[PDB]
Amino acid sequence: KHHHHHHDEIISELRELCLNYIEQDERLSRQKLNFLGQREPRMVLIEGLKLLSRCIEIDSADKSGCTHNHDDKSVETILVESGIVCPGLPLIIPDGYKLIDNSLILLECFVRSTPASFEKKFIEDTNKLACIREDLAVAGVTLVPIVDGRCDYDNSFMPEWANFKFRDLLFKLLEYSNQDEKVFEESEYFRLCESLKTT
Amino acid sequence: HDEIISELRELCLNYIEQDERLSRQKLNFLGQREPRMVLIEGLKLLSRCIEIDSADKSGCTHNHDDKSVETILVESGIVCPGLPLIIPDGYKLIDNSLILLECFVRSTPASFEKKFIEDTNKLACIREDLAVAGVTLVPIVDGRCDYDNSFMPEWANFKFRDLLFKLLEYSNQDEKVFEESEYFRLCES
Ligand SMILES: O=C(O)/C(O)=C/C(=O)C1(Cc2ccc(Cl)cc2)CCN(Cc2ccccc2)CC1
Ligand SMILES: [Cl-]
Ligand SMILES: [Cl-]
Ligand SMILES: [Mn+2]
Ligand SMILES: [Mn+2]
Ligand code: NA
Ligand code: NA
Numbered sequence: 001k002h003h004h005h006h007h008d009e010i011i012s013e014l015r016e017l018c019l020n021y022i023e024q025d026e027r028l029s030r031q032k033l034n035f036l037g038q039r040e041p042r043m044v045l046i047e048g049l050k051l052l053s054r055c056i057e058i059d060s061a062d063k064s065g066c067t068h069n070h071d072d073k074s075v076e077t078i079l080v081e082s083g084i085v086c087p088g089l090p091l092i093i094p095d096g097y098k099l100i101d102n103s104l105i106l107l108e109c110f111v112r113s114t115p116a117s118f119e120k121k122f123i124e125d126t127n128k129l130a131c132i133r134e135d136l137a138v139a140g141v142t143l144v145p146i147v148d149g150r151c152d153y154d155n156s157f158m159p160e161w162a163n164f165k166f167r168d169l170l171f172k173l174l175e176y177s178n179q180d181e182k183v184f185e186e187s188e189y190f191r192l193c194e195s196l197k198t199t
Numbered sequence: 200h201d202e203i204i205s206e207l208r209e210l211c212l213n214y215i216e217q218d219e220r221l222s223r224q225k226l227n228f229l230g231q232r233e234p235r236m237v238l239i240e241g242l243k244l245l246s247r248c249i250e251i252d253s254a255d256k257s258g259c260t261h262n263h264d265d266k267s268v269e270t271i272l273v274e275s276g277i278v279c280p281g282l283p284l285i286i287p288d289g290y291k292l293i294d295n296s297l298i299l300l301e302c303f304v305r306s307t308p309a310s311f312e313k314k315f316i317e318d319t320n321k322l323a324c325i326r327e328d329l330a331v332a333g334v335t336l337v338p339i340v341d342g343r344c345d346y347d348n349s350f351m352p353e354w355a356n357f358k359f360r361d362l363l364f365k366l367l368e369y370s371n372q373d374e375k376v377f378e379e380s381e382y383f384r385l386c387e388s
Contacts, residue, residue, distance in 0.1 A: 040233065049382040110381065113388055153385070174386060191314070192242040195306040198345060199357070199364045 007176045011044050014169050018051065021162040027058050027068055028157065041177045048170050052153060052163075057095045059155035060109035060148045066096030073097075075106065075132065079139070086139040089132060096146075104141050109148040122149045200369065204237055207362050211244070214355035220251055220263050221350065234366050241363045245356075246304070248348035250288040253302040253341045259289035266290075268299065268325065272334070279332035282325055289339075297329060298337040304346055315342050 003009060018032055031054045035047040061068035075092045079085070082099055096107030108125040112118040129145035136143045153163060184190055211225055224247045228240040254261035266274075268290075269282045275292045289300030301318035305311040322338035329336045346356060377383060 040235065045386070046377055046382065049385050053382055053385060111385065111388075113384075153388075170386070189239050189242060191310070192246065192304065193238070193367060194310070195304050195346075196242070196360060196364055196367065198306055199361050 007041055007173065007180075010169050010173050010176065011041065014044065014048055014166065014173070017162055017166050017169070018048075021159060022051075022055065023157040025058065025157055027070060028054060041173055041180060045170060045173045045177055048166070048173070052166065052170075055155045055157040056111065056150070056153060057109060059157065060150075061096035061107060062156070064096060064105075064107050064109075064146055064148055066098045066105055066107045066146070068096050069094055075104075079104075079141070084139055084141065086135055086141070089135055092128065092132065094129075102140060102142055103144050104136060105144040105146060107146045107148060109150065111150045111153055113151070118149055118151065122147055125149075200234070200366075203362050203365055204232070204234075207237065207241065207359065210355055210359050210362075214351060214359075215244075215248070216350040218251065218350060220261055221247055223263070234370055238363055238366050238370075241359070241366075245346045245348075245359070246302075248350045249304060249343055249346060250302045251350075252348050253343075254289035254300060257289060257298070257300050257339055257341065259291045259298055259300045259339075261289050262287055268297075272297070272332075277332060277334065279328060279334065282328055285321065285325060287322075295333055296335045296337050298339065300339045300341065302341045302343070304343045306344065311342055311344065315340055 015036055018035055022028065022032065028051075031047070031051050035044070035051045038044045038047050058068045060066075072093050073081075075094065075097075076086060076089045078094075078097050078099070092106075094106045095109045096105075098105040106129055108129060110121050110125060112121050125147045126145070129143065129147070133143045133145075153167065154160065155163070158166065208229055211228055215221065215225065221244070224240070224244050228237070228244045231237045231240050251261045253259075265286050267282075268285045268287065269279065271287075271290050271292070272279050277292075285299075287299045288302040289298075291298040299322050301322060303314050303318060305314050318340045319338070322336065322340070326336045326338070346360065347353070348356065351359070377386075
């Protein structure tokens with residue numbers, strides 16, 4: 001009834017935003033539910049950040065004409081599920097993928113907030129996909145690699161204002177959580193932990 | 200994780216002697232599902248074992264219900280207003296002497312000495328208040344260097360701690376992914 005705007009209300013507002021202002025796309029159902037079920041501040045924070053990330057990844061997949069990698073399949077798994085074997089193959093989990101004929105589109109997306117880190121991340125993700133172009137070619141597959149670098153957190157599943165307010169509340173939860181942890185590290189419980197070093 | 204919590208519960212149930220003073224904290228421990236809470240209640244359960252041994256060795260009543268000093272006195276008909284809020288690991292009123300006990304575990308000499316002085320000061324700060332009310336404080340500080348206790352076999356005490364430590368390890372390893380991952384950038388953004 002009376003809003004005092006402390007951490008429990010911060011968590012409750014994040015849940016309202018999640019429920020009522022993030023589009024009801026079925027690919028988001030599992031992470032929304034994961035988020036809504038968290039009770040510990042640090043865990044609300046973490047799954048909240050992951051929910052936001054998932055909105056951006058799926059947004060990228062849709063705009064890039066790719067299938068979003070819902071279950072975090074590896075490239076090997078994606079291949080093996082279509083009857084194609086590539087056995088010497090490093091671990092790569094793409095944000096998106098699409099096998100058309102003999103062509104395998106693979107998508108990496110990211111958000112960076114400065115030009116220097118934008119460019120650095122773009123190079124890293126590009127090299128990441130490139131290093132398996134040859135193996136795929138051996139197995140008869142043409143790699144079509146896509147790196148979608150973004151400069152902000154905008155996405156089609158949340159209105160701009162809600163996206164901003166969701167991030168704003170996550171930041172306030174982070175501040176609370178950090179203070180909660182500092183207070184914990186001054187408690188006897190933390191001392192008893194330290195002592196558990198007996199092992 | 201489930202296996203870890205499941206192993207911890209079996210130890211709690213089968214290899215901690217059934218002294219009834221431990222029953223409540225065992226039940227508190229057994230109802231925890233969340234890792235951070237399992238760890239805290241597990242450490243409290245080990246602490247209760249040590250405290251009860253200490254009380255039994257000091258001719259004191261273990262403070263099972265977390266009574267305050269103020270409460271302990273009232274129950275014996277003694278009124279002492281203004282007392283700061285202190286909850287002792289143990290107590291006993293004999294004649295006009297109130298034995299108060301503080302127990303602790305520390306695993307280095309440096310941390311041992313620091314805690315010993317802290318609990319000593321903690322009790323000392325109400326000596327005058329009690330004397331005004333006609334009560335002589337008998338303050339006991341009992342420092343332990345490990346979690347050894349009369350309620351558990353040494354092998355079970357070690358396994359219990361080993362499991363709690365693995366829980367703590369997993370949590371530190373998790374927070375090192377929130378540290379190095381895309382979700383970190385977002386949070387520091
Ligand atoms: O450092 C210690 O050895 C120690 O015995 C600590 C405690 O008893 C407190 C923490 C605690 C430690 C162990 C257990 Cl089993 C339960 C609680 C903290 C001090 N107290 C804090 C407090 C003060 C006033 C009112 C309530 C709580 C009580 C709980
Ligand atoms: Cl498609
Ligand atoms: Cl804005
Ligand atoms: Mn205590
Ligand atoms: Mn104590
Ligand atoms: Na499409
Ligand atoms: Na805005």
